[PDB]
Amino acid sequence: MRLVRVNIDNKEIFAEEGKTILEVAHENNIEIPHLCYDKRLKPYGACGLCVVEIEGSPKLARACSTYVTDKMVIKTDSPRVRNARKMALELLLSEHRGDCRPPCVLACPAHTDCQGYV
Amino acid sequence: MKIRVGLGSCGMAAGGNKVMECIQQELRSRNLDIPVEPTGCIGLCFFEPLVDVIDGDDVYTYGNVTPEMIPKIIESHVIGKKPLDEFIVSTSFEPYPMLKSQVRIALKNCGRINPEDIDDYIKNGGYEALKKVLTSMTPEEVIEEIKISGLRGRGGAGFPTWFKWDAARKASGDIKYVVCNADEGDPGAFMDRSILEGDPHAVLEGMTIAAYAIGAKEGYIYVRAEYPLAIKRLEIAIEQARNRNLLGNNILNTNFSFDIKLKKGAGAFVCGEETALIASIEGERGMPRLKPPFPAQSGLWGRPTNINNVETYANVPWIITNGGKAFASLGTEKSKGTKVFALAGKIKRGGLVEVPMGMSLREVIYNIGGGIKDDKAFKAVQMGGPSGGCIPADLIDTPVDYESITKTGAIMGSGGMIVMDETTCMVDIARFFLEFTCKESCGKCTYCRVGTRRMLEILDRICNGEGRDGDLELLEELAVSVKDGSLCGLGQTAPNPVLTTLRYFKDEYIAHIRDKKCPAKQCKALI
Amino acid sequence: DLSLLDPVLDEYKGEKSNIIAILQKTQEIYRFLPLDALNYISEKTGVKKAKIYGIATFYAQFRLKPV
Numbered sequence: 001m002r003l004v005r006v007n008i009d010n011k012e013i014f015a016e017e018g019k020t021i022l023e024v025a026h027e028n029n030i031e032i033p034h035l036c037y038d039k040r041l042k043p044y045g046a047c048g049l050c051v052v053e054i055e056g057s058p059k060l061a062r063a064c065s066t067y068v069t070d071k072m073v074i075k076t077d078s079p080r081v082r083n084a085r086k087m088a089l090e091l092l093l094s095e096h097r098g099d100c101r102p103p104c105v106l107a108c109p110a111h112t113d114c115q116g117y118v
Numbered sequence: 119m120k121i122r123v124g125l126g127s128c129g130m131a132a133g134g135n136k137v138m139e140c141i142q143q144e145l146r147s148r149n150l151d152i153p154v155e156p157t158g159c160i161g162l163c164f165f166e167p168l169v170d171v172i173d174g175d176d177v178y179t180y181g182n183v184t185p186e187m188i189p190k191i192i193e194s195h196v197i198g199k200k201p202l203d204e205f206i207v208s209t210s211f212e213p214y215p216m217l218k219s220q221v222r223i224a225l226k227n228c229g230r231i232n233p234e235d236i237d238d239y240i241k242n243g244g245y246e247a248l249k250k251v252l253t254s255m256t257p258e259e260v261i262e263e264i265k266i267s268g269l270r271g272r273g274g275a276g277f278p279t280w281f282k283w284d285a286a287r288k289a290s291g292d293i294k295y296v297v298c299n300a301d302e303g304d305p306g307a308f309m310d311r312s313i314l315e316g317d318p319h320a321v322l323e324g325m326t327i328a329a330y331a332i333g334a335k336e337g338y339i340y341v342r343a344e345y346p347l348a349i350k351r352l353e354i355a356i357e358q359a360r361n362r363n364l365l366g367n368n369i370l371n372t373n374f375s376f377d378i379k380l381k382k383g384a385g386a387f388v389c390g391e392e393t394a395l396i397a398s399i400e401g402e403r404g405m406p407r408l409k410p411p412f413p414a415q416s417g418l419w420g421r422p423t424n425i426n427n428v429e430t431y432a433n434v435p436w437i438i439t440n441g442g443k444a445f446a447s448l449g450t451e452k453s454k455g456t457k458v459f460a461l462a463g464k465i466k467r468g469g470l471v472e473v474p475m476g477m478s479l480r481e482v483i484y485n486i487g488g489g490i491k492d493d494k495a496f497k498a499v500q501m502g503g504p505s506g507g508c509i510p511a512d513l514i515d516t517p518v519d520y521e522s523i524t525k526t527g528a529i530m531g532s533g534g535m536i537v538m539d540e541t542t543c544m545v546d547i548a549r550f551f552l553e554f555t556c557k558e559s560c561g562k563c564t565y566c567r568v569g570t571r572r573m574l575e576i577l578d579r580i581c582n583g584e585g586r587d588g589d590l591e592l593l594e595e596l597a598v599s600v601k602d603g604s605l606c607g608l609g610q611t612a613p614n615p616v617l618t619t620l621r622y623f624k625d626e627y628i629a630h631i632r633d634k635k636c637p638a639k640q641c642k643a644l645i
Numbered sequence: 646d647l648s649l650l651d652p653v654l655d656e657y658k659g660e661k662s663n664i665i666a667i668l669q670k671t672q673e674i675y676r677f678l679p680l681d682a683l684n685y686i687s688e689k690t691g692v693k694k695a696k697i698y699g700i701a702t703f704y705a706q707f708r709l710k711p712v
């Protein structure tokens with residue numbers, strides 16, 4: 001094995017080889033959004049929320065599939081990444097039919113959890 | 119005399135079957151023993167049904183042949199030994215001008231031989247590249263020959279083929295495959311259907327050379343089940359080749375073994391993708407998987423596979439027999455060789471054209487295509503298919519090349535250039551192809567599954583005039599986000615029309631949305 | 646009827662990677678894919694039923710309604 005030297009959000013990390021960017025960021029307290037990622041399953045790539053900007057690469061790389069290499073500079077909150085995630089979330093919401101909070105909660109000026117205590 | 123009839127899918131619907139039946143009946147009536155054989159499309163689809171009479175080396179083609187005109191042909195040329203010249207359109211003395219500006223490598227034997235006869239391909243120099251590879255060659259030399267020849271792409275991808283062959287042969291594993299991408303998802307492009315129906319043995323020879331160069335022992339051809347004539351011709355060719363020991367185990371009394379099985383896709387645009395093709399062959403739905411694990415390193419069932427188009431496989435034997443240097447002398451410095459296009463739309467003479475790379479689009483449209491129908495102004499070309507772009511009138515001089523076409527936004531794609539005049543409205547065209555791509559998405563990733571639909575409704579609102587403000591900026595942002603966020607190539611190339619129509623024809627959209635009318639007067643809701 | 650599919654399932658047996666060919670043959674025979682025929686394919690060939698329905702509904706050529 002070899003310890004790879006990466007840089008995630010201007011923080012130098014000494015990660016282990018054969019690890020995805022998602023695992024490295026999880027074990028180093030860096031938050032990367034993900035919706036279609038599970039540890040027990042092979043990568044899927046559907047949601048496209050875990051996109052991170054890697055220096056030297058033109059396209060945003062999925063953190064759930066890309067493996068950390070040596071001398072890797074990863075930006076997980078750059079404006080390009082934020083715009084990509086925001087567009088993905090808007091597209092997901094465009095086909096969403098739900099109610100995060102009931103109208104009773106929203107009508108209350110104090111926003112008391114009316115459904116909850118009822 | 120040797121009678122040949124265009125029996126390709128093109129001729130079939132045109133009436134080639136009835137022409138062949140009538141000419142056989144006429145020869146029976148006049149007790150004449152003349153070999154009547156089928157042949158594939160020669161590129162002049164508009165002249166079909168076609169009958170070619172061969173004497174010695176000369177060939178005479180009768181355009182728009184009809185059963186009632188068969189007896190005249192028999193009594194003039196077959197019986198009287200005198201060309202009619204009243205219905206003959208082209209001959210060996212003077213080829214049709216549409217065929218004088220084309221160089222033909224993939225379609226060199228498409229329409230001049232008998233597809234259901236191995237000996238006809240053999241007598242035309244066929245299966246000599248395979249012999250030269252088998253005896254005085256080594257797989258590394260085959261990789262080197264393909265690399266020198268500069269062959270690449272031909273499925274619209276544009277990736278070097280030698281790199282894929284090297285990656286497949288160097289990859290770990292003792293079992294490797296060789297697949298052929300014959301699933302023409304774009305309706306309007308039939309290059310490889312025509313190649314399979316007309317000259318199916320170049321595909322087999324290229325696949326065999328690729329297997330030798332890679333180290334494969336099994337082969338697959340992914341042909342759509344909607345091509346029955348292509349499947350029949352391929353099965354006949356495979357059986358005949360196995361008869362001559364040109365396929366199967368122990369090819370030409372060597373240790374080399376290679377066999378080909380035929381896979382029939384149910385029919386889906388996305389199933390043409392490499393990874394979706396692999397999933398469909400494996401027996402699952404055609405959902406493209408992630409690319410960085412590549413088919414050259416992990417394809418069908420985890421073993422390395424080499425997936426190539428029909429055209430590159432057809433170009434391989436010519437490369438081997440004539441050498442890499444001869445192939446590399448055709449085309450630009452970036453793109454070597456020749457490319458096949460399916461001219462259609464408002465062009466004067468549609469059909470298949472094999473042109474050298476770097477030949478200007480204006481030359482193809484005017485000199486080869488014959489100009490615009492009814493001599494109207496030429497507005498744009500929808501190059502690449504439903505995932506291509508609208509190259510405008512002023513960019514008519516961009517040379518045919520992967521880099522030169524892509525620099526204009528469009529893609530080589532399925533080589534289907536849809537010629538359009540000033541009558542056509544750009545918003546409807548962009549909405550037309552985007553609708554097709556949205557219907558053909560597989561639905562895995564959010565950007566392609568729902569983003570394309572949002573773009574389609576935005577375009578519909580624009581065309582109906584009911585579009586709100588901010589529609590152009592929102593549409594452009596949606597298109598660039600779908601293009602840069604989608605997983606597979608069906609989503610990354612999905613908004614190519616819109617984007618292109620927003621780079622050259624932004625004023626059309628602006629007049630559509632603000633003035634609530636279109637200059638082209640084609641939108642039904644606005645006329 | 647279900648015996649009509651008996652030859653097809655006999656030809657494409659031994660491998661669960663030929664389900665699309667079997668579905669196309671069933672589509673040719675019955676002109677549609679009834680749920681009982683899909684159940685028979687699932688039982689005979691040994692592929693999971695969800696996979697059968699997914700591969701059946703993926704393509705626009707396959708219709709699950711009588712013609």
Ligand SMILES: NC(=O)c1ccc[n+]([C@@H]2O[C@H](COP(=O)([O-])OP(=O)(O)OC[C@H]3O[C@@H](n4cnc5c(N)ncnc54)[C@H](O)[C@@H]3O)[C@@H](O)[C@H]2O)c1
Nearest residue numbers: 273274275277282285303304412413414505529531532607
């Ligand atoms: N025929 C049609 O109807 C049609 C429709 C839409 C698009 N297209 C075209 O086809 C293209 C499809 O894109 P894609 O994603 O399939 O192509 P791609 O650009 O991802 O790669 C193309 C080929 O290169 C190979 N490759 C790339 N890097 C490799 C490596 N390092 N090692 C080994 N092999 C490697 C891939 O396996 C594949 O065979 C689009 O760009 C478009 O231009 C064609």
Ligand SMILES: Cc1cc2nc3c(=O)[nH]c(=O)nc-3n(C[C@H](O)[C@H](O)[C@H](O)COP(=O)(O)O)c2cc1C
Nearest residue numbers: 271272273275299301302390391392426427607608
């Ligand atoms: C939606 C879609 C459809 C495709 N259809 C075809 C096709 O019909 N034939 C083909 O050769 N490649 C097609 N491709 C490209 C393949 O993914 C892959 O690039 C191709 O098999 C490479 O062949 P080549 O090396 O000969 O260029 C398609 C790609 C996409 C995204």
Ligand code: SF4
Nearest residue numbers: 096097098099100101
């Ligand atoms: S409606 Fe329910 S499922 Fe949808 S976002 Fe709100 S909490 Fe989540």
Ligand code: SF4
Nearest residue numbers: 560561562566606609
């Ligand atoms: S872009 Fe469309 S077709 Fe391609 S994987 Fe995503 S959803 Fe499927």
Ligand code: FES
Nearest residue numbers: 034045047048064
């Ligand atoms: S978590 Fe969805 S693409 Fe990686």
Ligand SMILES: [Zn+2]
Nearest residue numbers: 543636640641
């Ligand atoms: Zn209009």
